[PDB]
Every structure is written in structure tokens, then in C-alpha cells.
Amino acid sequence: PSRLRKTRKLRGHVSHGHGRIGKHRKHPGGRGNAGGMHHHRINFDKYHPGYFGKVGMRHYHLKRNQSFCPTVNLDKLWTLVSEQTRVNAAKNKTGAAPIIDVVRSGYYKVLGKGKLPKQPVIVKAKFFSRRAEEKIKGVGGACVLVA
Amino acid sequence: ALRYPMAVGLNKGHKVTKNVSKPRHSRRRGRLTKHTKFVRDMIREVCGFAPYERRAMELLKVSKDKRALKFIKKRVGTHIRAKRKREELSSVLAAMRKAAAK
Amino acid sequence: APSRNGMILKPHFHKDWQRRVATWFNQPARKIRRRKARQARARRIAPRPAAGPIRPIVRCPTVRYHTKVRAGRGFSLEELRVAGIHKKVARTIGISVDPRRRNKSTESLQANVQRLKEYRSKLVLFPRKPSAPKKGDSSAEELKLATQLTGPVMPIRNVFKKEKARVITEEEKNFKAFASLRMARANARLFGIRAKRAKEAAEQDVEKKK
Amino acid sequence: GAYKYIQELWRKKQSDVMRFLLRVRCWQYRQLSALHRAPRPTRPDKARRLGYKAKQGYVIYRIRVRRGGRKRPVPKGATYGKPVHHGVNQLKFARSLQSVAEERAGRHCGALRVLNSYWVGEDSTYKFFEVILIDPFHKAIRRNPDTQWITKPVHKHREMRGLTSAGRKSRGLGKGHKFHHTIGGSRRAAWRRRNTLQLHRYR
RNA sequence: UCAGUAACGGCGAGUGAACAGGGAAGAGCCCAGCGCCGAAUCCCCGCCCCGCGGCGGGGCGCGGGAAAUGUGGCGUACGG
RNA sequence: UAGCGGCCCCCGGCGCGCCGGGCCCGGGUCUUCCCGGAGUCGGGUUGCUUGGGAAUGCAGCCCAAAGCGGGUGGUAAACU
RNA sequence: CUAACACGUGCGCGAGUCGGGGGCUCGCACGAAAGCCGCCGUGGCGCAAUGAAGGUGAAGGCCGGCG
Numbered sequence: 001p002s003r004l005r006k007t008r009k010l011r012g013h014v015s016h017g018h019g020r021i022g023k024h025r026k027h028p029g030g031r032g033n034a035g036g037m038h039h040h041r042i043n044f045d046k047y048h049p050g051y052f053g054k055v056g057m058r059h060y061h062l063k064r065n066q067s068f069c070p071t072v073n074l075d076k077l078w079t080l081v082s083e084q085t086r087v088n089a090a091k092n093k094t095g096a097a098p099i100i101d102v103v104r105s106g107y108y109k110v111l112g113k114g115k116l117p118k119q120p121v122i123v124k125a126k127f128f129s130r131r132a133e134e135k136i137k138g139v140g141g142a143c144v145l146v147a
Numbered sequence: 148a149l150r151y152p153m154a155v156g157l158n159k160g161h162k163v164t165k166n167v168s169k170p171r172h173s174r175r176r177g178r179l180t181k182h183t184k185f186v187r188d189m190i191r192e193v194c195g196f197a198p199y200e201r202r203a204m205e206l207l208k209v210s211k212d213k214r215a216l217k218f219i220k221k222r223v224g225t226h227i228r229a230k231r232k233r234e235e236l237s238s239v240l241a242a243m244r245k246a247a248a249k
Numbered sequence: 250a251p252s253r254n255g256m257i258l259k260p261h262f263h264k265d266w267q268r269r270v271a272t273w274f275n276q277p278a279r280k281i282r283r284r285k286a287r288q289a290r291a292r293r294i295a296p297r298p299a300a301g302p303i304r305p306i307v308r309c310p311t312v313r314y315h316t317k318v319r320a321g322r323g324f325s326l327e328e329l330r331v332a333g334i335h336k337k338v339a340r341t342i343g344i345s346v347d348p349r350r351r352n353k354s355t356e357s358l359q360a361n362v363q364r365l366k367e368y369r370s371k372l373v374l375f376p377r378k379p380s381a382p383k384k385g386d387s388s389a390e391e392l393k394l395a396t397q398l399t400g401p402v403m404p405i406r407n408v409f410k411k412e413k414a415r416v417i418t419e420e421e422k423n424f425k426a427f428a429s430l431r432m433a434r435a436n437a438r439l440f441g442i443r444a445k446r447a448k449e450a451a452e453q454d455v456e457k458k459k
Numbered sequence: 460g461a462y463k464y465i466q467e468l469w470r471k472k473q474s475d476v477m478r479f480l481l482r483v484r485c486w487q488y489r490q491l492s493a494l495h496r497a498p499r500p501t502r503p504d505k506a507r508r509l510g511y512k513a514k515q516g517y518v519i520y521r522i523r524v525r526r527g528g529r530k531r532p533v534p535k536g537a538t539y540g541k542p543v544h545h546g547v548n549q550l551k552f553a554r555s556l557q558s559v560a561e562e563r564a565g566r567h568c569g570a571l572r573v574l575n576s577y578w579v580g581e582d583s584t585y586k587f588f589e590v591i592l593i594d595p596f597h598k599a600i601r602r603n604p605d606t607q608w609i610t611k612p613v614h615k616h617r618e619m620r621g622l623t624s625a626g627r628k629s630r631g632l633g634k635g636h637k638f639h640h641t642i643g644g645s646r647r648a649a650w651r652r653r654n655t656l657q658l659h660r661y662r
Numbered sequence: 663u664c665a666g667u668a669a670c671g672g673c674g675a676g677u678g679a680a681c682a683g684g685g686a687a688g689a690g691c692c693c694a695g696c697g698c699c700g701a702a703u704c705c706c707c708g709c710c711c712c713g714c715g716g717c718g719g720g721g722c723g724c725g726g727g728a729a730a731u732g733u734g735g736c737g738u739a740c741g742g
Numbered sequence: 743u744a745g746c747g748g749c750c751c752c753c754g755g756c757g758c759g760c761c762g763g764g765c766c767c768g769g770g771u772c773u774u775c776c777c778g779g780a781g782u783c784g785g786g787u788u789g790c791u792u793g794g795g796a797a798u799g800c801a802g803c804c805c806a807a808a809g810c811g812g813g814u815g816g817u818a819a820a821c822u
Numbered sequence: 823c824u825a826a827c828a829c830g831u832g833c834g835c836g837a838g839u840c841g842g843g844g845g846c847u848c849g850c851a852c853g854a855a856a857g858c859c860g861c862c863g864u865g866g867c868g869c870a871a872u873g874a875a876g877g878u879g880a881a882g883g884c885c886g887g888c889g
């Protein structure tokens with residue numbers, strides 16, 4: 001609202017909060033990002049290093065869909081299925097292990113970060129990591145690849 | 148052992164049976180028909196050959212094969228078209244030589 | 250001029266952008282008009298489905314979405330022929346038909362055939378002449394219960410199959426999935442160069458023997 | 460039929476037979492005037508292919524267009540401005556000479572509608588095109604269901620709006636990754652759609 | 663929405679799409695050619711009958727013309 | 743003003759019936775035949791244009807096709 | 823005034839959050855509002871970073887079993 005803005009409190013002060021020595025002129029330093037290498041060089045180098053120059057290869061017809069690969073972590077791994085699944089597996093005595101499919105829930109690669117509760121799991125995914133594999137093996141379980 | 152389908156490798160991809168079917172009739176275009184061959188050879192017989200074609204035929208007759216290929220490529224365009232044209236001209240020359248001998 | 254600290258910005262307002270501005274003050278009126286036209290057409294086609302012709306099952310054509318199932322443009326001729334539907338009669342009895350789509354697999358073809366057979370079993374066909382019915386027609390008593398249905402006909406669902414919890418055997422507990430992926434990548438990368446090396450080794454052995 | 464033979468003949472433009480013919484015709488056309496009605500198509504097969512039918516109401520005009528490029532119409536040089544716009548005599552027109560010929564024929568005959576056109580001969584300084592026109596008010600076409608589309612008012616001056624086969628080629632119309640400049644109606648439409656702000660009601 | 667992204671740019675200032683995905687809407691078709699049908703096709707003038715304020719339908723004309731340098735029917739890549 | 747309020751006039755659209763006119767029409771299997779658009783594609787160069795980068799698109803000039811061919815598969819080239 | 827960004831503040835929900843586009847609501851004084859969608863969360867931002875790229879991708883500490 002215009003009621004609460006600084007302009008209302010600024011009426012009557014000739015200057016309008018912009019100084020008498022240096023006025024409020026149009027474009028004292030140039031428009032936009034001008035002088036990035038000449039008279040704004042200090043600011044550009046101090047606050048945006050690496051701005052100027054080229055690096056890396058050019059990929060012309062990039063399609064993000066080819067590289068689409070969402071990831072999940074082992075601490076979140078048990079949240080894909082319902083709690084009743086996990087508790088039933090926990091108090092089960094036959095040794096049967098529930099099957100968790102991350103592709104069904106929309107994940108492609110499993111990365112092993114969190115601690116895993118001690119019960120067998122059949123994790124089926126598209127890609128695995130070495131540490132996630134070893135975590136699943138240590139907790140007791142199976143890793144299954146799907147396409 | 149275990150052979151799980153994978154997203155990577157030589158046999159990457161979800162497995163599914165692939166059903167055979169008759170190819171679409173649109174794919175048949177360009178196939179040479181007997182009547183069309185008859186028409187084209189009649190027209191060639193009445194017309195003759197282009198000047199560049201006969202110059203290339205002279206080059207092949209004197210057996211400068213690389214020169215003929217380079218000249219045809221320059222005169223016509225792509226290397227594939229040049230190779231096809233050179234093959235057809237050599238076939239024409241062979242047919243003419245056989246007819247002259249017999 | 251840059252202030253103390255902040256982001257470098259590239260606003261795309263260096264053209265005469267104020268002359269080409271699309272205000273949306275007619276959005277509610279547009280929605281009202283589209284609705285009215287929708288109900289007008291629904292009334293126009295009296296017993297027919299409001300949504301339109303049934304459509305087929307298709308898979309999204311990308312690694313990002315190939316797990317999902319859409320509604321396609323129309324049934325293809327292979328599916329129509331194997332379901333016993335003429336390509337010209339399908340359009341006039343309510344089946345969307347396109348001739349561009351192929352059928353590389355068999356599961357999708359069979360699923361769409363099942364869909365078409367279910368649609369034939371479900372639809373009610375009115376007499377071509379209201380007085381005298383014909384052989385390929387529906388009897389009179391169920392005509393009294395023919396009504397429009399809202400939404401797409403037989404809507405598409407993404408159904409996920411559970412398998413029950415299994416028991417572990419030692420056979421799949423010795424499977425090195427990460428190692429398998431790494432060697433699969435290596436083999437795919439080095440397949441061609443290995444073939445060329447084998448070829449030149451073979452020709453060198455032949456040369457040495459000769 | 461004879462058409463197939465004719466077509467395969469005309470494809471052999473470097474043969475001595477066709478070369479002699481083309482020479483003789485080109486001489487005759489150059490001797491004639493710049494725009495005149497031909498009694499009958501020179502290429503019956505090509506007229507058939509493009510849509511001509513030997514019935515009343517179909518007329519054919521043979522026209523010649525001066526060859527070459529397009530030099531900038533500026534007083535001496537004087538294309539005042541930055542050096543990037545100093546070019547005078549190496550520029551090229553955006554439309555083809557076939558389209559220019561069709562538009563000239565359509566402008567001269569304002570009571571007819573242009574259907575298509577074809578090339579019949581050329582030389583160093585001229586190009587010769589025969590263009591098919593249709594009289595839209597003749598009963599012979601107004602009573603024929605499949606050709607009465609051209610009698611609609613929407614199809615006035617197709618060559619002037621770039622709707623003929625020759626005119627369309629210059630618009631960059633197509634499907635695929637090669638023709639992204641004209642997604643939508645045309646270049647104008649694509650540029651408009653890309654260069655407006657969609658200031659929504661809520662934002 | 664992808665996306666101020668892939669990319670272009672004294673690679674500086676700046677410029678800059680598309681595919682997929684969700685929706686609004688949704689509708690498909692016709693020639694030339696290749697061939698088969700005694701040109702089986704079309705326009706116009708005269709007389710008779712109908713209504714004619716969007717000049718049409720039927721019949722009779724040893725009436726005229728177009729058209730074989732090709733009109734009409736079947737038929738077009740989904741095959742015929 | 744409100745009202746699935748009243749009265750009168752005119753035009754339309756949907757159904758029904760009558761006369762006249764045209765129309766003789768489809769599907770499956772087997773056998774035999776047939777099937778395509780040229781100064782166009784494409785190449786070189788020049789100029790403009792594009793995010794399109796050893797040339798995205800357009801145009802002028804020169805060269806200029808093929809039929810298991812031709813186009814596309816976002817880095818030029820040969821083989822596959 | 824519009825757009826972008828940064829930071830500070832107030833409110834709702836919270837590892838989630840957000841219908842802005844569309845649709846359903848006998849369209850219509852207000853009402854062009856408001857309500858609803860949940861198998862309309864497509865999608866955006868966040869939940870993972872790093873490398874030019876191929877790619878890889880986030881603890882471990884004690885005893886019995888061959889110091």
C-alpha cells in the first residue's frame with residue numbers, strides 16, 4: 001500500500017532522500033551489467049567469480065529426459081511402503097521379506113545414506129550404488145535390477 | 148546364474164515379445180517395377196546420354212577410374228550418388244562392349 | 250550499476266514489450282463460454298458419450314515416463330482387424346481410429362483388443378430405422394435405459410501389481426548388482442573395439458599360418 | 460500410357476532432343492511479349508499433375524520474368540546507416556521468380572484465380588513460366604463439387620498471399636526440427652507468440 | 663510447464679527455442695499417374711410442364727460447342 | 743422491477759406424411775496384376791535470416807539426379 | 823506501475839508445499855465473486871552433491887570365532 005511507503009514520509013524534503021551534492025541522475029554507471037570488466041570489475045570479481053570465460057564441451061540437442069534419473073536414500077527407503085507392511089514383516093516369523101519397488105513410486109537410483117533397520121528387504125530398482133548394495137547385504141536382503 | 152534385465156549394456160531394455168507384421172505399403176516406394184524399367188530404358192534409348200555422362204564414359208573407357216569418380220562427384224554432388232552413377236555407366240560400357248564383341 | 254552483493258540478472262525487457270501484453274481479464278468469460286459450448290454439444294448428441302470416442306492404451310515414449318500409460322490418439326488398423334472391426338465402421342460407431350500407429354509388441358496390442366471387445370460388449374446401438382430393427386442391433390427393452398455418461402469412456406488407470414512377500418534363497422543373495430552394472434557398462438563401451446582387435450588378431454594368425 | 464513416357468522424357472533435359480526443343484521454344488517465347496495467353500499447355504503432363512483439366516474455365520498464361528537477383532533501390536549508394544546495411548548489389552529476393560511470375564499473372568487477370576505454375580524454359584536474361592488460372596464464375600466449375608472450393612471468397616489472390624505451391628516454399632513452412640521458426644501460422648505468428656507477456660490475472 | 667534451459671554472442675552487452683508431460687478442441691479426406699469401361703463427361707440455345715425475391719428439376723429437339731494434346735465412374739500409399 | 747407471467751404477429755430449426763427423380767451398391771478367403779508428382783531433390787558458392795553452432799530456414803547463379811531409391815537420425819568425412 | 827532478485831518481518835502447512843492452467847458447481851443483482859477437485863500434483867521449488875564429460879554419489883564403535 002502507498003500509505004506505508006517511504007514516499008509519504010519524504011514529502012517536504014527537497015532532495016527526496018537522494019542527496020544534494022550527488023543528485024539522482026538517470027544512469028550514472030551505465031545501464032544493466034555495463035562495465036563488468038572495466039569499472040565494475042572489483043564488484044564482479046568479489047561477488048561473482050568465474051563469470052567471464054568458457055569451460056566444458058558443448059552439447060547441442062540436449063534432452064533432459066534421457067538423463068532423467070531421480071534418486072532415493074536408504075533412510076527414506078522404508079517410507080515408500082505403508083507402515084503396516086513394515087510391522088508385519090517385523091513380527092513375521094517365516095523369514096519372508098517385503099518387496100519395495102522404487103520405480104513404482106518414481107525413483108530410479110538408490111543411494112545408501114541412512115541407517116537401515118534390521119529386517120530383510122527385497123529392494124528392486126534400476127540403478128544401485130556400492131554402499132547401498134553393501135548396506136542391504138549387511139542388513140540381510142536382496143538387490144534386484146529392473147529395466 | 149542370475150540374468151536380470153538392465154537399463155544399460157548390450158541387451159538394455161525392458162523385455163517384451165516383438166510381433167512380426169507385414170511392412171507398411173508406404174515402405175514399398177522406390178521399388179523398381181518391370182513396366183517402369185521398360186519405359187525408362189525406352190526413353191534412354193531414344194534420348195541418349197548427357198555430355199558429362201559421355202565424358203565420364205570416355206574416362207572409364209580409358210580406364211582412369213579415380214578420375215571418373217572425382218569428375219562425377221564434382222559434376223553431380225554426393226559421393227553415394229557418384230558411386231551409383233559410376234557403377235551404372237560401367238555397366239552400360241560393359242553392355243556396349245559385349246554387344247560389339249558379339 | 251551493481252549494488253553491494255546480489256544476483257546478476259538479464260531481464261528480457263529491451264524490446265517494446267508494452268505493446269504486446271496479454272491480459273487475462275477474459276479468463277472467467279472464456280471458461281463460461283467453453284462450458285456453455287460443452288453442454289450445448291452434449292445436448293446435441295443425445296445418447297452418445299459426452300467425452301467422445303473411446304481411445305486406446307499407449308505408453309509414454311520416453312525414459313522419463315515409459316512407466317506410465319496415456320490415452321492414445323486412436324486405435325490402429327492391426328488392432329481393429331484382429332478385433333474384427335472395419336476401419337470405416339469403427340468411426341461411425343464410436344471408435345477413434347488412426348492409421349499412423351504401428352504395433353511393435355504384442356502386450357499392448359492384446360490390451361487394446363480386450364478394450365475394443367469390452368467396448369463392443371458395453372455399447373448400446375440404436376436402430377438405424379426407429380420402427381424396424383436390424384440384425385446387427387440392440388433389442389428394444391434396453392434402449393429405455395440408455396443415458397449419457399460423463400467423463401472419458403472406460404477411463405485409463407495405472408494399475409500396479411503386488412507380489413506377496415517372498416522368502417530369500419541364497420541364489421539371489423550372492424548377486425553383485427553394482428558390479429554387474431559396472432561390467433555391463435564396460436562391455437557396452439568396449440564391444441566394438443574388442444571385435445576389431447579380435448578381427449585383426451585373427452587375420453594376423455592367418456597370415457602367420459600361411 | 461503416354462504420359463509416363465512424356466514425364467521420363469522431360470526428365471532428360473540434357474539429351475539433344477530436349478535441348479533442341481528447349482532452344483527453339485525459348486527463342487519463340489523471347490520473340491513474343493512478356494505476358495500472353497497460351498492456347499493450350501506446353502506440358503500437358505505437368506498441367507495434369509498440378510491440377511489442370513482440359514475443360515472450359517481453365518486458362519493458361521505464359522509469362523517471362525527478368526532473371527538475376529535484386530539490387531537495393533537506393534539513390535546512388537547512400538543506404539544511410541551502419542555499415543552492416545551498406546549492401547547494394549549482392550542481395551537476394553525472399554521470394555522465387557516462379558512466385559513473382561504467378562503474382563504478375565494474378566495481378567493482370569484479377570477476375571481469375573491462380574492454381575499453379577510450371578517452368579517451360581529459360582535463358583541468360585529471362586525465365587519462362589506457364590501458370591494455370593481458373594475462372595471462378597464459370598458454371599463448368601461452379602457445378603462440379605470437387606473444384607468449387609476455389610470459388611469461395613477465402614481463396615482470393617492466393618499468389619499474393621503466398622498460398623500457391625511456389626509461394627509456400629518461401630514461407631519456410633514444414634514439420635520437424637528444421638522449421639521451428641514457423642510453429643503456428645507463420646513467422647509472424649511464432650514471433651508474436653514468443654514475444655508477448657502472459658500477465659495472468661493472479662500471477 | 664519444459665525454461666530464461668540446450669544454444670548463440672567484440673562468448674561482452676545481450677539474445678534464446680524445441681521434444682517429452684498435463685490440458686482446451688478434436689475430423690478426416692481428394693487428385694495426377696498406373697489401369698478398366700463404345701466420352702460412358704461437361705457448357706449453351708429453342709419448345710413443353712413445376713415453383714421460381716439464393717434461376718433449379720423432368721421431357722423433347724438428324725440443335726450448337728467443348729473434349730481423345732483426355733471429360734466422367736472405380737481408385738491414392740491406411741495398399742488398390 | 744420479479745414472475746417455467748398473459749395476449750398478438752413474423753421468421754427458423756427438429757420430426758411426420760405425399761409426389762417425382764438418382765442409386766443398385768457390401769464383407770471374408772484364394773489366384774493374377776499395378777503402384778506415384780524433375781531444372782525438382784541434391785551439391786558448390788553468394789547474400790539475408792535463425793538458438794541452430796564445418797552453414798536452421800529462404801533466395802540468386804552454376805552443376806544437376808536415382809529407383810531395394812530418396813529424405814531425416816543437431817560436428818565435417820569414408821565404410822557398415 | 824509491472825517483472826526479477828536479495829534480505830528482514832507477519833500468517834498457513836511442514837519433508838513437504840503450492841491449483842496460478844483446466845474442470846465440476848441450475849452461469850450471471852452482488853457473482854468477472856465464492857466453493858469443490860485428490861487417480862486433475864502434470865509441474866515448479868525443496869528433499870544430494872560433485873565432475874568439462876564418460877560417470878560416481880555422503881559414519882561407524884566394542885566381544886566370541888586362527889593378535
Ligand SMILES: [Mg+2]
Pocket residue numbers: 013
Ligand atoms: Mg533531512
Ligand SMILES: [Mg+2]
Pocket residue numbers: 022023028
Ligand atoms: Mg551518486
Ligand SMILES: [Mg+2]
Pocket residue numbers: 021022
Ligand atoms: Mg561530485
Ligand SMILES: [Mg+2]
Pocket residue numbers: 025026
Ligand atoms: Mg535510478
Ligand SMILES: [Mg+2]
Pocket residue numbers: none
Ligand atoms: Mg548506490
Ligand SMILES: [Mg+2]
Pocket residue numbers: 553
Ligand atoms: Mg526479408
Ligand SMILES: [Mg+2]
Pocket residue numbers: 628
Ligand atoms: Mg527447395
Ligand SMILES: [Mg+2]
Pocket residue numbers: none
Ligand atoms: Mg527453473
Ligand SMILES: [Mg+2]
Pocket residue numbers: 674
Ligand atoms: Mg571479451
Ligand SMILES: [Mg+2]
Pocket residue numbers: none
Ligand atoms: Mg532476435
Ligand SMILES: [Mg+2]
Pocket residue numbers: none
Ligand atoms: Mg508437446
Ligand SMILES: [Mg+2]
Pocket residue numbers: none
Ligand atoms: Mg479432453
Ligand SMILES: [Mg+2]
Pocket residue numbers: none
Ligand atoms: Mg482419368
Ligand SMILES: [Mg+2]
Pocket residue numbers: none
Ligand atoms: Mg542475425
Ligand SMILES: [Mg+2]
Pocket residue numbers: none
Ligand atoms: Mg554425428
Ligand SMILES: [Mg+2]
Pocket residue numbers: 252253254255828
Ligand atoms: Mg541488495
